[PDB]
Design a protein around this ligand. Structure first.
Ligand SMILES: [Mg+2]
Length: 118
């Protein structure tokens, strides 16, 4: 799989990630700025992978993961968290997420993750 859907309410964070993914070979299927959008885009783009920011407006990542799973129980979701946001990561994993990555990014780490998920 190679199409990616980046979800994060922070432009910069998207930018960065978009650059990493892209140089690593992946394709940026799309961008989402919140949970809702994340789901809408998901149904529309059928990304191969999804990266998920937890803390966003309107709808958080955890709920979005839950939603996507209901739509696609084979969805491939990596969750993004700051450090120490450990209790949230457990909840996202439990909810569906295959793995997580910390912010601010570490291209090596980011890439590995993306690859295992494939
Ligand atoms: Mg956020």
């Amino acid at each position: 799989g190679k199409r990616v859907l980046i979800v994060d309410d922070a432009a910069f964070m998207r930018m960065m990630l978009k650059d990493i993914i892209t140089k690593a070979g992946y394709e940026v299927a799309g961008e989402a700025t919140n949970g809702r959008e994340a789901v809408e885009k998901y149904k529309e783009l059928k990304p191969d992978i999804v990266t998920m920011d937890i803390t966003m407006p309107e709808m958080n990542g955890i709920d979005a993961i839950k939603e996507i799973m209901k739509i696609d129980p084979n969805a491939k979701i990596i969750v993004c968290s700051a450090m120490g946001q450990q209790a949230m990561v457990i909840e996202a994993i439990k909810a569906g997420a295959k793995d997580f990555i910390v912010k601010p990014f570490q291209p090596s780490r980011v890439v590995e993750a993306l690859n295992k998920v494939s």
